[PDB]
Nucleic acid binder design. Structure first.
Ligand SMILES: [Mg+2]
Ligand SMILES: [Mg+2]
Ligand SMILES: [Mg+2]
Ligand SMILES: [Mg+2]
Ligand SMILES: [Mg+2]
Ligand SMILES: [Mg+2]
Ligand SMILES: [Mg+2]
Ligand SMILES: [Mg+2]
Ligand SMILES: [Mg+2]
Ligand SMILES: [Mg+2]
Ligand SMILES: [Mg+2]
Ligand SMILES: [Mg+2]
Ligand SMILES: [Mg+2]
Ligand SMILES: [Mg+2]
Ligand SMILES: [Mg+2]
Ligand SMILES: [Mg+2]
Ligand SMILES: [Mg+2]
Ligand SMILES: [Mg+2]
Ligand SMILES: [Mg+2]
Ligand SMILES: [Zn+2]
Lengths: 24, 206, 127, 80, 98, 155, 125, 60
RNA sequence: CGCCGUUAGUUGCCAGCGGUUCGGCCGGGCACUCUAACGGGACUGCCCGCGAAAGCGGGAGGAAGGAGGGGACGACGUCUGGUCAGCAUGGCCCUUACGGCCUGGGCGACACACGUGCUACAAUGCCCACUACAAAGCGAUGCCACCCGGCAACGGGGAGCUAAUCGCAAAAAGGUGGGCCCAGUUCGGAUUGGGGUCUGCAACCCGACCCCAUGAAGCCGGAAUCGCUAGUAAUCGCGGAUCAGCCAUGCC
């Protein structure tokens, strides 16, 4: 989970945002 | 390992800061540096007076250096032509207009920095260490004081194997905050190494 | 006009207001059950009123600030238990032995250096 | 998956040197220490000597390797 | 309606000089909004105890800035005249807006 | 426990059966601090104990715990020789823990997919006498009265 | 049904099934179902023969998939192998191309451990 | 460190990314808390001497 | 840190009435929460039993009861322990190099082995959507609301905040809904091909991030072995220091 870049959990873990964790 | 700085531990209560000013996170760095330069130009040139401490305070640009020496004679000079030279030599490093004051030390044998400072100088003049220390302590104990303790580091006497010499009497209650234990460290640049002189001086309670 | 208690619990603060009424409890501009929706522990915030017979004889306007909902439950619980004692000092008898008056001083322990986590110690080899 | 945005980079002392030798003939060997520089189409031809921390190397320069960085062709370490 | 955010590194020296800024009157001239608490900001530094290795040693230092507010409503000119040479703390600072 | 005999903690009673055992079970079912969905399991399990049986769930949960509590167990012993498996009695405190632990573990071995179901069926099966929990209990007591020869080390 | 060259994803949701083709994952599935208007959720067996067609006519004519991709990449590597490239060497040795460590931990690029004798005169390790 | 290696003194560092820190007291290049401008080791020394105003042993 | 009081009202409110562009937004007041200075509070002080005493067991009252919880704090000494590469510093040593400046390389090398970790092997789970509750911190040549372009990293524009007032900021597990249905899977995200963004003179060696495709090993681990006695372990997110950027899953 936390390892996959293209997921909710995964993007949260790596600080970031994007297609898979919209900033808002 | 062990034993925190008996000053820095008590810094909260029984002992207040040498330099006591306020500054923002864009200034603190600079004031601190220059504050240091002053102590350096001060601890070197004022050796003879034997300076125990240097209080430094700041405000509306100005800087209130309050030097504590045993013999304010040597900081005054020709009736002035020395306290002027030094308030001047500070005006160059500090572009901010300094104000040099001088504080008498009633009892040099009740200020750990000086006591230690005393011992240091003997060890260079090749005095007998063991006695120096037993003596130093007595001179401090004879001057009132609830207790006192001195420590010389290693290579006592040119001895190839570094040692440690001791001496201490009265109470020197290190783990109690409610103490007031002036601490002082002196270096001793001998021919064959360096030596460290730690001096503890207990007095009062609350 | 109403009755009041505070009640804190583990970084959380409730303020408990006790009106006389039908049993309608409201928590932070919301219904009591709308706020603790689906948290089985919830019903235990009202264990004072249950054990002094007051479950439906009071309304209760409660504000809650800080922490997490399960501590807010425990803190409301203290809040209620206190209001209900300054409304009738005799209630302590059927209230103090239950424990509802005590405040739970159990709080998160500080993170220690050279540990991973206050007590979790780093793992070592060769011994 | 690399990085040349709306800038594109080629260290210029080497560039003014190669474009200069595109007014006529191709200088056999050019002594560079800048492996930093991308290869432009105008380099396809003249053999450039990329350094190494130890030795300039005879990197002949095909058109099949344009978008690449110079140092990608002068291996640094030595292995078995 | 004058604004006065006070701040320094010591708070024995703050509350004892914010008090000295409330020397217009206790409450008989201008309103006085009382010395306002206003949360302190704590910087921390964490230093490895020795030089060279011993990761697990560590020692904590903090430097905390305490902040006060006060604020006086309706500034009579003699109230201001007192904002001249009337101070003693050295480690206390003084923001002033209106 | 080198100094004091160390007392047991008093879990507050259930919110729905007002019971202590049911908190205990719920606590053993819980992992990673997720107590909400441990209770969300035990209760879901309780709905299932009825819609599969005319009996009330508390009476069944209690009934099955009793069928798993072990009257005897062995714990090893170092002597003037080696390891001897001494048959011991089992305190009422330890039977509690052992039963509950065994019940969850047994439940999670099961092939049913929802957790509540696994708990449900284990809780049921154990009441009716059978089921993995009971098997690692009828088993445990079988090692006692087999090392009966070493009963004379009763501690 | 046959969506891409020799592909046959059946019996799961359409989106999930499409990923069983080489050049296709969660994102091109979502996309190519939106852009052909088939409800992603339907099982494969319940796809209209008409649907199955508008699906294929997109996927196949719009993207390099399966075979025509597998040898685009393979021949893409041979490119950096055929020039003097560093990534080429790394490809040729069989060692982490994207600038990793190899002192430990490059198992996935290296294959299983080829363990060798370690000492000649030093303790037990 | 090397007295020579205080070309941190080099006011123009050519590129602003060759700019680095160094303890203004000892030269240390490697724990220089930027607030103080001092390295970690100097900081503890000065903290204990009470020459960092306001700075104190911290416990909580 | 836990209970309470006094001082203090540009943070806090169906406490109490007035207005509402149903936001404590407005008048308005500080009661409450809080903020942070100064105080009270605990004493085996009270009761019952054992005790020669110290104290032990228990019980009241209390927020807390015998060291209430956690820090700071480490004795004479030991290890000839670590560190002359933080800093000093005796001695010895080099002095068109054992000093100094560059550019490039190295510290990142891979047949192997170990330590400390991270992410996992899934249904008490994973995915998507909606929605709820933190604490501590940091912010000027900085945090960036909001608007526009981009699938997105991010670019353009731009408000506020020297910050209890603006921003980082979304807390996340949780809760409600839907999907997946025992599969190496909608588990796991390693590897690799491609296209990009930003930082920096510059990202080949050797940056982080985003997007598309690829989708490895892994089905709970031999011998052995580590942590933890309570808000502890387990688990979930958040912040800082260092720092252009960042290899941070480390540390505090
Ligand atoms: Mg996944
Ligand atoms: Mg925690
Ligand atoms: Mg030139
Ligand atoms: Mg320690
Ligand atoms: Mg040097
Ligand atoms: Mg740098
Ligand atoms: Mg209070
Ligand atoms: Mg109204
Ligand atoms: Mg007695
Ligand atoms: Mg050594
Ligand atoms: Mg290294
Ligand atoms: Mg090793
Ligand atoms: Mg957009
Ligand atoms: Mg669901
Ligand atoms: Mg396991
Ligand atoms: Mg313990
Ligand atoms: Mg974990
Ligand atoms: Mg950073
Ligand atoms: Mg972090
Ligand atoms: Zn330093």
């Amino acid at each position: 989970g936390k390892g996959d870049r293209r997921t909710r959990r995964g993007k949260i873990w790596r600080g970031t945002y994007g297609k898979y964790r919209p900033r808002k | 390992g062990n034993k925190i700085h008996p000053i820095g531990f008590r810094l909260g209560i029984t002992r207040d800061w040498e330099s006591r000013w306020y500054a923002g996170k864009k200034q603190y760095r600079h004031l601190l540096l220059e504050d240091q330069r002053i102590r350096g130009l001060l601890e070197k040139e004022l050796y003879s007076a034997g300076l125990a401490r240097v209080d430094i305070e700041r405000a509306a640009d100005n800087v209130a250096v309050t030097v504590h020496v045993a013999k304010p004679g040597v900081v005054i000079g020709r009736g002035g032509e020395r306290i002027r030279v030094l308030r001047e030599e500070l005006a160059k490093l500090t572009g901010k207009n300094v104000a040099l004051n001088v504080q008498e030390v009633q009892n040099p044998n009740l200020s750990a920095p000086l006591v230690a400072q005393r011992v240091a100088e003997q060890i260079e003049r090749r005095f007998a260490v063991r006695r120096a220390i037993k003596q130093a302590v007595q001179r401090v104990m004879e001057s009132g004081a609830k207790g006192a303790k001195v420590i010389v580091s290693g290579r006592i006497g040119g001895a190839e194997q570094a040692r440690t010499e001791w001496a201490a009497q009265g109470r020197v209650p290190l783990h109690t905050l409610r103490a007031n234990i002036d601490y002082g460290f002196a270096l001793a640049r001998t021919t064959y190494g360096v030596l460290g002189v730690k001096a503890y001086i207990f007095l009062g309670e609350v | 006009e109403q009755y009041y208690g505070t009640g804190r619990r583990k970084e959380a603060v409730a303020r408990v207001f006790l009106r006389p009424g039908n049993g309608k409890v409201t928590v932070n501009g919301q219904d009591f059950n709308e706020y603790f929706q689906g948290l089985v522990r919830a019903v235990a915030a009202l264990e004072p009123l249950r054990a002094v017979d007051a479950l439906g004889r009071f309304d209760a306007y409660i504000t809650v600030r800080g922490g997490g909902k399960s501590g807010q439950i425990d803190a409301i619980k203290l809040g209620i238990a206190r209001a209900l004692v300054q409304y009738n000092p005799d209630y302590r008898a059927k209230l103090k032995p239950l424990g509802f008056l005590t405040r739970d001083a159990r709080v998160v322990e500080r993170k220690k250096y050279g540990k991973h986590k206050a007590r979790r110690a780093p793992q070592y080899s060769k011994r | 998956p690399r990085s040349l945005k709306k800038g594109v980079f080629v260290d210029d002392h080497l560039l003014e040197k190669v474009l200069e030798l595109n007014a006529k003939g191709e200088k056999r060997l050019i002594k560079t220490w800048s492996r930093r520089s991308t290869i432009v189409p105008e380099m396809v031809g003249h053999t450039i000597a990329v350094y190494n921390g130890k030795q300039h190397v005879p990197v002949y320069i095909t058109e099949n390797m344009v978008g690449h960085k110079l140092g990608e062709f002068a291996p640094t370490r030595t292995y078995r | 309606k004058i604004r006065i955010k006070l701040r320094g590194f010591d708070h024995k020296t703050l509350d004892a000089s914010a008090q000295k800024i409330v020397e217009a009157a206790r409450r008989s001239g201008a309103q006085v909004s009382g010395p306002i608490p206003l949360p302190t900001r704590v910087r921390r530094f964490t230093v490895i105890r020795g030089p060279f290795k011993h990761k697990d040693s560590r020692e904590h230092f903090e430097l905390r800035t305490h902040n006060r507010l006060v604020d006086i409503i309706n500034p009579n000119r003699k109230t201001i005249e007192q904002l001249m040479t009337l101070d003693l703390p050295t480690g206390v600072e003084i923001e002033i807006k209106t | 426990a080198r100094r004091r005999r160390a007392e047991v903690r008093q879990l507050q009673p259930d919110l729905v059966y007002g019971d202590v055992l049911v908190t205990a079970f719920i606590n053993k079912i819980m992992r990673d601090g997720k107590k909400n969905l441990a209770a969300r399991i035990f209760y879901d399990a309780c709905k299932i104990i009825q819609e599969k049986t005319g009996q009330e769930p508390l009476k069944v949960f209690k009934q099955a715990v009793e069928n798993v509590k072990p009257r005897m167990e062995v714990r090893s012993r170092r002597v003037g020789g080696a390891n001897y498996q001494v048959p011991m009695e089992v305190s009422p405190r330890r039977q509690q823990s052992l039963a509950l632990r065994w019940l969850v573990q047994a439940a999670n071995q099961r092939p049913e997919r929802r957790a509540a179901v696994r708990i449900a069926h284990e809780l049921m099966d154990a009441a009716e006498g059978k089921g993995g929990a009971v098997k690692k209990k009828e088993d445990v007591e079988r090692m006692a009265e087999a090392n009966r020869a070493y009963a004379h080390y009763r501690w | 049904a046959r969506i891409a060259g020799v592909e046959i994803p059946r019996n799961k949701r359409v989106d999930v099934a499409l990923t069983y083709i080489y050049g296709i994952g969660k994102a091109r599935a979502k996309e190519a179902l939106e852009k052909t208007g088939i409800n992603p959720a339907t099982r494969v067996k319940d796809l209209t023969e008409a649907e199955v067609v508008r699906l294929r006519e997109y996927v196949e004519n719009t993207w390099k998939l399966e075979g025509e991709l597998r040898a685009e990449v393979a021949a893409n590597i041979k490119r950096l192998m055929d020039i003097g490239c560093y990534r080429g060497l790394r490809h040729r040795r069989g060692l982490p191309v994207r600038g990793q460590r190899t002192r430990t931990n490059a198992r996935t690029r290296k294959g299983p451990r080829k363990t060798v004798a370690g000492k000649k005169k030093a303790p037990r390790k | 460190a090397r007295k020579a290696l205080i070309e941190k003194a080099k006011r123009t560092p050519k590129f602003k990314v060759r700019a680095y820190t160094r303890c203004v007291r000892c030269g240390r290049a490697r724990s220089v808390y930027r607030f103080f401008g001092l390295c970690r080791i100097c900081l503890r020394e000065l903290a204990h001497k009470g020459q960092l105003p306001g700075v104190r042993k911290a416990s909580w």
